[PDB]
Structure formats: C-alpha cells, structure tokens
C-alpha cells in the first residue's frame, strides 16, 4: 500500500504549521471522492525552462497521496518551431490561424511536451499517466475565421478518474476533438477552465513564469483581484490585452458557476507547495466578491 | 525490465510444466538478456467484452516475469450494436466499414470505453498500464469518397510505446489512426497490429480471437499450419475466406515477407496464449513464410 | 531504522499537531541521526490483556517513524487470577510474591501468552516485533527461603535485543531472569525495565500503568513532577505511599542516581505516549534528578 | 505481499523436473491445512564449519514460500569453550553430565549459535525468529546420573505456528524446560523427534555433516534402513555406539507412530533441495518396512 520516505514526512512537516491546515491535509489525503484536490494548469514555456522544479513539485504531490490533475499548454515551443522553419505564426482577433500543417505542428509539441513532463515524474518514481484524448469535445469556434480552433462543450471525466483511481497523476494535453474526431486546438488557460468546472477542485491554480499578472499601469504586480468589483473595469484598462483579456474572462464564468469559498491562483512553481498547503498565496488570487 | 513472480504467477508458470524440456523452455526466455522486444499482440474486442478476466490474468503474467508486450485492440461487435440501438444499418464494402461522422462518433467512444475497461482490468491486478489512444499511427485516407474516414496506415511513431515499457507500464493501444492534421480514421486492427510489427520486428506476433484460429469454411476445421510461399496464392481464391480473413491473411503474408523467415504469427483463443508463447504448442493457427 | 510512513502513521503523525511548536518536536526527533537507544517502556500486564490494541498502535507509530523502542511487560492480573481459579492464594511479602514451583508454572505460561499476544498484535499491523522470553536477565537469588523462586538481577546481556533492533524488529522482553545455570526467576518488571535504562541509556524512559501516574493519596491529585534530590526523602515517610509505590519511586531514584542529570522517567496512561514522548507534555508523573 | 526475485524463480525451476514435483510444491506453497512441510534439524557443527551455505538453502526455501522448522543443536562448541578454559567434558552412558556451569556454558552456546544461524538468513533477507524457549517441557531424565538434563515429555506448537503464520522461520534451540522454570539440556536429535511427532510434516531431515550414518563395519554408507527388519539386530552391532544409538532409538519410536508415508532422511546440508522436492535423497534414509 501507501508508504512515505522521511524526506517527504519532512517536507510534509514543513508546509504544515496550523491546526487548520493540518485538517485540509487530511480531508483530502483521506476523502475517498470524486471531487479533487487541484486542477493545476500548466504554462508549456514552464516545462521547457523550469522541468526539474515543476516535476518535484509534482512529484512531492504525489508522495504525500494528493492527485492532482494537471493540464498544460504547449504556447511558445509551437511558435518556436514554426519560425525554425521559416513560418511566421498567424494571428488574428488574438488568436492562432491553425491550417493542415500548423495543427501537425500543434500536435507534435503537445505529444513532445507532454511525453516530457510524463518521464519527469516517472523519473523521480511518480505514476504518470498521459492522456493526449478522449477528455475534451468540441465544435469549432468560428470555422472560417481560425480554422482548427474549437470551443468546448463538454469534459468526459473517465479517463481522469480512472487514472487517480489507479494511483497515477493524469497529466492532460489541451486538444479537442469534434465528436467526429476532427482534433481542435484549445487554449490551454480556458481549457483549464472547464476541467475545474465539471471537478469543483478546492484549488484552481494556473502555473505562469511572471507569477501572477502586471499591471502595466503601475508595474506592480496585482496580488488580488475581487471580480464582481472589479471585473468590468479591468476589461476597459489598456493594458489589459491578449492573453490576460480571455483568461481574465474564463476566470470570472467559472467563479460565478463555481460556489463563493473557490478561487483560482496564478503563480510561479516555487509557491505552488506554500499555495496547497496554506491559505495565504502569492501571485495573482482572483476571487469572487 | 521488472520481474517479480507473485503467487499467482509462481503458481500459473508451474501449473502446466511436467516435463525437464518444459522447464528448459522457461529457462531460456528468463535467462535471456534480449533487448528484443517480447511480442505484440492484437486482441479482437469481442474479448474484452466477453472474457476480460482471463485476457487481463494473461497479460498479467507476462508483465509480471518482465516479458512486456505491446498490446493492440479493436472494438469489438459493441460499435455495430451501439449502432443498431440507435437504429444505423452498418455497411461493409470489400470488407471494409463505411465510417460516416455519426458512425465515428460511436467507434470513438467504444474504442475509449473498451481501452480503459482493459487497461483497469490490469490495474486491478497490480499491473501497471498506459492507455495510449493516439500519436501512433499516422494514416492518408484510404478513399475518402468510397469508404469515408477509413485510413491507410504510412508510418507509425514508436515513442509513446517505448516511452511506457521503460516506465514499466504495458501499452494498451486502440486501432485509431489519425491523418498529420488531426482527424482520426478507423483502421483494420489486423492491419495495425501488422504494422507494429513491421517496425519493432519482436521475438513473437499473437492474434487473438474467439474462434481459436482460422476456420477452413470447407472441411469444418481448424487450420494448424499455413506454409504461405506454398499455400498463399490458391488459399486466397475460395469461397470460405471470409470479407474479414482476405485482409487477415494478406496483410500476415506481407508482413512475413518484410520479416526474417524465423518469425511466424500465431493465431489463437486467449485461453492458449500461456503455452503458445513458451511451449510450442500446436494450439491455432500458426503461419510462416516456409520453405 | 527503517522509516516508513504508512496512511496511519500519517495520520496518528499529525492528528494532534496544532501549532509550529510541535512540528518542530516531530522535526527535531526525525531529523536527527543519534546512534542513542531512543525509548525503555515499561508495560503494565494489565494493558496487554485490557488495552492491546492501544498498545500495540502506539508502538506501531514508533517502528513506522524509525524510533524504536525496547518493550518490558509483566504479567498483568491474570496470574492471580488463574491461581485464584486454581484455588491458590497468592502472598506477598515486603511487597513481593512468594512464587514457588506451582505458582511459577503459572506465571510462566502467562507472561508467554501475554508475550505473544502483544507481538501478533504487532505482527498483525505489519509490525516486526521478535518475542524475547529469556536470555537477557541473569540473577541471583533474593532469599531462596523468604521468597523462593525470585530473583535479584545482577547482570544483562545485550545481544539479543541489540540483534532484534538491528534486523528491524522490536524486542518485546518478559520481565523473567534466569540463573547462569538455568533456572527461571520472577522479577519485579518495574526494576527489569530499570535495569535495562541502566545499560542502554535511552532518550526517553517510560513505564505505562492503567492510573495515569502517581496519585497522591492525601489531596486526591495526580503528581505532575517530581524533583528526587528535594523531594523523596519526605514523599516515602507517608501513609499513602503504598506497598508497590515504595518499590517503584525506590528503584527511579536509584537508576537516577546511576544515569545522568538529562535523564527521566515518565509515568504515564498508554494513551498519552505518543505526546509524551515526542511533545514535551505535563501529562503523567514526570520523574528527575532535579537540582 | 510475496514476491519472487528472477534468481528465485530460475532456482525453483532447477529443482522440479516432474508433474508430481510441481504438485507437491504448490500443495505447500498454498498452504492449505495445518500440515507443516518440513522439520529440520541441524547439527551445531554446521552452524560454525558451513554457515552460509546452510543459510543460503534455507533462505532459498523461504524464498519459494516455504517455511520449515528449524531446530539446531550445539554439539561441538560447548565441548570446545570446556576444553578451551581447562574443563574437560564429562561423560556417562553416552550422555553429557550438566551441572551449574555445563549448562551456563550449554545456555551461552545455544544463544550464541542460534543468533548466528538467525542473522545470517536475517542478511539474505529472510525473517527469522529465534525461539529460544516455551516449546520443550521436560522433567529430569535421571537427576542423580546425569544432574540438568532433561527427557521431553510434550511440545507446545503455538510459538511455532505463530512464527510460520507471521512469515518468519522459527529457529530453535533444543533446551527443555521443567513445569517449574530450571532449563535441562535436551538432544537435539530427540527434539528433533518430537517436533516432528506432533507436526506429523510431509519431511524429516537431519543435517550432519558425513552425510548420513556410517557402517563401521564395511566403511560405507548406509544409503537405506528398514527398521522393522534391521532395528533390533542394528542395534546389538557393535559399531553403533553413542550418539548413532539414541538417535536410530527416537527414529523408530517416531516411525513407529507416524505413517508408512514418512521417513527420516539423515543427510548434507548439499543434499536438502534435492531430498525436500524429489523423492530420491542420498545419506541415510530411514522408513519403517
């Protein structure tokens, strides 16, 4: 059965210092349920720049019987590839043009990134299971104006719970497929998204690099941001563009959905431990007013 | 890879063994250092279905003597049932499926819940298993406008297997293709599992179905040997070769003729797939190129 | 030591853990690598028959965190009970039993029963433990005619339990001795546990009794501390102090008096072991040189 | 739960050969009834002159799932730590006078060789439990001839089966105890004996180190003994003296009591795996005709 190194006893010992925080450990190291721990979405720019931490992180995780789902993108790498070759990636309405060949491109880095971070975490003895599939339909978001982009619909759990139920840590990429098994790329931040809709998670927590959001404005970074205050305004701020504006929106959808005690932290790996441990986050904390 | 005999094991690998020859024959796939791979083995659905426990156990064993093999299923005849409850009439031409995008939809979800009921099935014997659905076989369309989302396999991409057998976790693959842009083609599993063998050229190639091998239509019997430079070419021109074994049987002669001459494909219940692979068992049908 | 946190370990680690204080305990006990015997717990029979699976819990968390203990037991109640059953009545005298042929049979019997039960109940959750019934006591005589077969322990032998530690089982001893030339002898176990604090030198020396501690029988209040260079010349000239509590704060004081100022002995009801051990609890009778 | 390394395994298969072989190893294997697979006995010597081999075959058959039990003496040693501080062993019709300090030298021999022959299968991964006492009650054989030794008259199996039904060999010693607590040495032969009475086990092997019993009269080895029809003339030839004498007397008293089936099989400790899973042993095979 489940046995614990006295390293990771340790390390256990070292996130946990309060009465309460002890007690959350326990309800879900414990809970014998289909409602997780943590949806953890994962920037791909991580997975090739920071791999070692984010698999210990992970990893840690694991040794102390919490499962996580984990979810990644594949962003920078598949820009990468494309100018390598002689191709300047497409863009319109901040969104990708994704044609015949640049889908084969999309789906190569998210098996290349996916199997990477998959052998990480084996590597330091965590059960892996990869699942490229099968979790995410969709239709297309505007055929004509983006091609192979959809817009899901709907999330089939089974293949994440068998994993957990197995003693593996899902570890899902963001592609869809129409029912008609036409493979649509998603963005890995609204994808995410709808993994934390359907698991009700006690932790939504989005891994970038910068560890949060900037406001351009200031140049702070934004520690906390309270939607039902803030939201319409924050859409209206220049600096608030691309990236930010549609992860801004998922965010706001799904803590309307979601009960009024969630919340969805953006941060770096090396507060990810601190963050699932305790309720004092670093980062970016958007909550529901 | 990890070998570690269970009681289950201990009792499954004497249970058999009777004979000093037997016990050699054991000796000398435990003893090997082969970095060859053990086998591949293409399982008809209708097994999964039907006779999980003793597919799962079987595989089991092999996993637990470290004798991983890469494992291809179809679906079974859910798809056609799954269709008729729906009320679509499943049309076949050449031997071949009509996979319309309604149709698909279904194949889909029957190879994902027949995928993961076998790879549980393992889990639950404590052996490790990885669902892989995709990125390994690359396909064009066969004909788009005669059979629709049907492929025609061209490459296969062997990371994702390798990839699970040193994590030490047996590949459960369904038979889905997609084409390099993302849109997944059924494919004969029979040809797939063909395919994983052209390219990882393993020590034994296993079909298994229920029949318990091949069935001369004619004489009412099962067919032990087929010598297929011989027989190949007036075995083909009958009546009884069904829609399903011309495709069968070719793509096993081609594949034979990409092999060396000491390989040879073996077709049985899995009820028979202990002995077949360490004793030599005249249990199915066996084929070879032959002399 | 074997560190192996399993889900109850976990569990009993940090189920009472509250402030970073007490992490810091747990911490200080798990990060440390002294080659010092960590514990000599001293087992009232009467909780092997009344409280085993408590016990056997506690001592279960030990192993599991690598901190193990030496266990003396005695035998509890049932002695009496099963020569009571027999007919015999027991007599003491100046606080010890005048155990003869007959009744030794019995006491025998009983603290091999009590041994076992104790061990399987460890065995039982996948705990080691190594059942040491003799070989580790020597002793003289006290007064053959007085009290007969009762001994006074002048030697200890080591090795076995040094053995059972280092294959990673907990030695669980009886409290008998033995002559050099073989014959067993009832021994008081609160002085056999003394002996054994005596030779190994341990972190913590813990005797379990059902009480709680030591009361003091004028106030009706248990007895949190007590300082021995002070206090025990005045605390033994009392009516309260009674015929086995004699014996017990008699023997503390002298091995306090053999092992240095750091050293104390706790006494304690099964249930606050674990606090008492790793937490530096106000629970029980706590034991010192004291200045 | 058990497992079984490559080497294990390859071990297994090199001792069965035959259908009836594999059937009589798994009919212990699966443990079934209360019926024991085998009583042991080891001399001393073998213990100080070939102690990783003898722990080696045993460690193999605890490996494989079988859990004989052991029971040593210590013959040679006890003689040699007399001798070795200027006492010579005394002797009587052919057995050892014990008094006060025979036996505190027969006592520190006994636990200092049964904690050898214990860490030794402990080093190869092996449970092994000492028992050291609790199993052998016995009342004087002759006080006044022969002072503290014993003649065993039952044997308690609970410590044995709680060992066997914990995964661990019991390694025992053959002291005796009367009711009332003074230990009397007991002939490791004769214990033997008894545990193999009351455990009626599918094997009995004594190990020595000739491997059997010699006739003095010829030189050669007695490769069988039928006692119902050589007992009685055996014992009157004049080669047959000491410890061969009291040893063949417990043996037929033994088979006498238990089945047709069973036999005594004295041999090497280089003959056990071969004696324990074939039905052909080489030494000395004893049956009853």
Same mark, same amino acid.
């Given at each position: ?8 006893? /340790? ?14 450990? %326990? !309800?879900?190291?414990? +809970? ?14 991580? &997975? ?43 863009? /319109?309405?901040?969104?990708? &043009?994704? @044609? ?14 996916? %199997? ?12 892996? $299971?990869? &699942? #490229? ?27 994440? *719970?068998?994993? /957990? !139920? ?7 990429? +963001?592609?869809? *497929? ?5 493979? %649509? ?27 949060? /959001? ?14 039902? *205050?803030?939201? @319409?305004?924050?859409? !209206?701020?220049?600096?608030? !563009? ?17 009960? $009024?005690?969630?919340?969805?932290? &953006?941060?770096?790996?090396?507060? %990810? ?6 309720? +004092?986050?670093?980062? #970016?904390?958007? $909550?529901?007013?």
């Amino acid at each position: 059965g489940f046995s614990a190194t006295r390293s990771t006893v /340790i390390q256990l010992l070292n996130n946990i210092s309060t009465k309460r925080e002890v007690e959350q450990y %326990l !309800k879900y190291f414990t +809970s014998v349920s289909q409602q997780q721990f943590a949806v953890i979405k994962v920037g791909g720019a991580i &997975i090739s720049d920071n791999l070692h931490e984010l698999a210990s992180c992970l990893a840690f995780l694991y040794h102390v019987g919490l499962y996580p789902i984990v979810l990644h993108g594949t962003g920078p790498q598949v820009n990468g590839r494309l100018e390598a070759q002689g191709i300047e990636p497409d863009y /319109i309405d901040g969104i990708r &043009i994704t @044609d015949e060949h640049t889908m084969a491109v999309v789906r190569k880095c998210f098996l290349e990134q996916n %199997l990477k971070l998959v052998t990480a975490l084996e590597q330091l003895g965590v059960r892996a $299971r990869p &699942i #490229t599939s099968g979790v995410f339909t969709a239709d297309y978001l505007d055929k004509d104006k983006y091609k192979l982009v959809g817009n899901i619909k709907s999330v089939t759990k089974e293949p994440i *719970e068998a994993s /957990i !139920k197995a003693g593996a840590l899902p570890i899902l990429t +963001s592609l869809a *497929e129409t029912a008609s098994g036409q493979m %649509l790329n998603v963005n890995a931040d609204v994808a995410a998204g709808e993994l934390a809709r359907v698991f009700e998670p006690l932790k939504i927590v989005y891994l970038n690099e910068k560890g949060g /959001i900037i406001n351009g404005s200031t140049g702070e970074k934004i520690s906390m941001i309270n939607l039902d *205050e803030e939201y @319409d305004d924050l859409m !209206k701020q220049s600096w608030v !563009k691309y990236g930010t504006k549609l992860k801004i929106r998922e965010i706001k959808e799904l803590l309307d959905y979601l009960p $009024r005690s969630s919340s969805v932290a &953006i941060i770096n790996v090396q507060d %990810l431990q601190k963050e699932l441990f305790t309720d +004092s986050g670093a980062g #970016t904390m958007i $909550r529901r007013g």
